Design a protein around this ligand. Structure first.
Ligand SMILES: OC[C@H]1O[C@H](O[C@H]2[C@H](O)[C@@H](O)[C@H](OCCCCCCC3CCCCC3)O[C@@H]2CO)[C@H](O)[C@@H](O)[C@@H]1O
Ligand SMILES: *[C@@H]1O[C@H](CO)[C@@H](O)[C@H](O)[C@H]1NC(C)=O
Ligand SMILES: *[C@@H]1O[C@H](CO)[C@@H](O)[C@H](O)[C@H]1NC(C)=O
Lengths: 216, 50, 88, 79, 76, 50
């Protein structure tokens, strides 16, 4: 399947402080959308609150003669709802135009494909949740040497649409199901082919051969 | 290959040659238990601290 | 296939991290010697720090990574009140 | 008043850690206490090859590799 | 001469809002021919990339000494 | 009050780094711990010559 990218829409409910880092444009479109031929899939929408002390100075003039600058600090609880989506292929999209999935990681978890809390070379991290980063590959060769086949995303409230239109919480085909993140008790997971994942302590050197020992 | 690994492999070969696939599989599973699934071809000597 | 002959001569430790062993990919624990380790040649790492078996070679990737993160948060809130009343 | 301090030290390789140790002393002490911090390998049936076993003929080692690999597959499937 | 010995075949630029006009007038986000697509910059979430031949780009950790020969060893 | 310090050190070659080290001590310590900081090579088929 083709994964056209993700974007996290941020709506400010009080103030304009939270959505300055919780918003994520789609890489391919430069906007909170999906590229042509891709259907945005609602991944998850959640609200987040944070207190901040904003300092502001104002020049108050009473009676047009008593002018004074007064500085005051206000402790406001800014609340913002972020809605994160992901772009799945709508149909027989052109190949291999799109993006490649290099695994995801959080500040408390690891990226098992690279066994590190970072993205591989030639990969860009995109913010998807408060603490989830996705490693996306622009170069086709570097991705193809540094990616894993992707099946789709799903949440604790909305399942995967590519199940076999019903949207169940199950990875299609032989794609395996591993946890991606837990947001306020809601599970978010991804789907990758079960053959590439293993115990993970020993990174197998799976390059050659491409055939079992040919018999005489 | 080491001496012991070769010896175990020879034992499995002989058991197969005796057309006795029963203890052949048992001997193979013993091989798996003793020598594990993979063979390490490269390590990184080092240290770590947190 | 001991290394004591080399140790008597060179007087060096033997690099204790060696490949060629078995590995239980399920339990993630070393299992048993599969490749043959011999110390016939008294091979040594180029820097002359360790005695290695003849069947291995070492790439010297001497690297160190250090991360230090410190974070201090303090909050102080002090409050006083004094109300006095007097009726004569 | 309420104090709560938690320290947690986790070491791999090097001298056994003790609280009053300095990173200089620990870094200078890994000269002999090195530990495998990362490893890569190959499936063992990849090493069951005619050229790797002189004592046995080729058709035999082929079947030997087959049975070893199916033993591995059973060992995986059970667990 | 200095540029020829210190440059790479170049296909053109494109941004997130306007693709490459040299695709094969429509302007798409695709490198024409065998030119490879590598990220160049991300300006305010807008992706700008370039197109260079895949023959020169490699893993990059090993700089090739690919100077002579200019032909495979000719058979006898 | 809020303090936040992040230090990150990355070393290739030389003595294992520790925070209190001076660049003098580190520079005088590379006398045997030298590593490959750059490399150039040729394709494999280039060496298979009569
Ligand atoms: O103050 C309490 C809050 O402190 C932090 O938040 C900080 C935040 O991380 C910072 O970015 C901003 O301060 C910014 C200070 C200036 C903002 C307005 C700009 C002014 C600057 C002066 C000239 C006029 C414009 O809000 C608060 C107060 O520090 C944390 O969120 C948390 O400890 C708590 O909720
Ligand atoms: C413990 O309490 C004391 C006051 O008795 C205080 O000064 C100190 O910061 C607290 N923490 C530690 C680690 O001592
Ligand atoms: C840490 O906080 C102290 C006050 O306790 C301050 O003096 C200092 O500048 C801050 N930074 C460092 C690196 O100590």
């Amino acid at each position: 399947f083709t994964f056209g990218g993700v974007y996290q829409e941020c709506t400010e409910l009080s103030g304009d402080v939270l959505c300055q880092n919780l918003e994520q444009k789609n890489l391919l479109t430069g906007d909170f959308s999906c590229p042509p031929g891709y259907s945005p899939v609602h991944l998850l929408s959640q609200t987040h609150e944070e207190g901040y002390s904003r300092l502001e100075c104002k020049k108050k003039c009473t009676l047009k003669i008593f002018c004074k600058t007064v500085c005051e600090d206000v402790f406001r609880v800014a609340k913002a709802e972020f809605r994160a989506y992901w772009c799945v292929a709508a149909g027989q999209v052109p190949d291999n135009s799109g993006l490649l999935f290099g695994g995801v990681f959080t500040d408390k978890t690891i990226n098992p494909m690279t066994n590190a809390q970072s993205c591989p070379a030639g990969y860009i991290p995109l913010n998807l949740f408060e603490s989830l980063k996705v490693c996306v590959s622009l170069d086709y060769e570097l991705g193809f040497k540094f990616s894993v086949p992707f099946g789709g995303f799903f949440s604790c409230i909305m399942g995967n649409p590519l199940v076999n239109a019903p949207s169940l919480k199950k990875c299609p085909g032989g794609f395996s199901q591993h946890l991606a993140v837990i947001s306020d008790g809601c599970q978010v997971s991804y789907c990758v082919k079960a053959g590439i994942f293993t115990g993970g302590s020993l990174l197998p050197v799976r390059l050659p051969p491409y055939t079992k020992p040919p018999l005489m | 290959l080491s001496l012991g690994f070769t010896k175990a492999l020879m034992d499995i070969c002989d058991q197969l040659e005796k057309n006795q696939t029963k203890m052949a599989t048992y001997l193979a599973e013993l091989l798996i238990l003793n020598y594990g699934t993979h063979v390490i071809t490269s390590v990184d000597a080092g240290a770590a601290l947190v | 296939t001991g290394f004591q002959i080399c140790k008597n001569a060179l007087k060096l430790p033997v690099l204790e991290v060696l490949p060629g062993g078995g590995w239980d990919n399920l339990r993630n624990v070393d299992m048993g010697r599969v490749m043959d380790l011999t110390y016939t040649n008294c091979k040594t790492t180029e820097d002359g720090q360790y005695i290695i078996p003849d069947e291995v070679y070492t790439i010297p990737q001497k690297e160190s990574n250090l991360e230090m993160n410190s974070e201090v948060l303090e909050s102080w809130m002090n409050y006083q009140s004094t109300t006095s009343l007097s009726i004569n | 008043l309420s104090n709560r301090t938690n320290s947690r030290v986790q070491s791999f390789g090097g001298v056994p850690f003790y609280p009053g140790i300095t990173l200089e002393t620990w870094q200078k002490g890994i000269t002999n206490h090195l530990v495998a911090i990362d490893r890569a390998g190959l499936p063992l049936h990849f090493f069951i090859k005619p050229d790797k076993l002189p004592g046995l003929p080729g058709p035999l080692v082929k079947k030997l590799s087959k049975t070893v690999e199916t033993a591995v597959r059973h060992y995986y499937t059970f667990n």
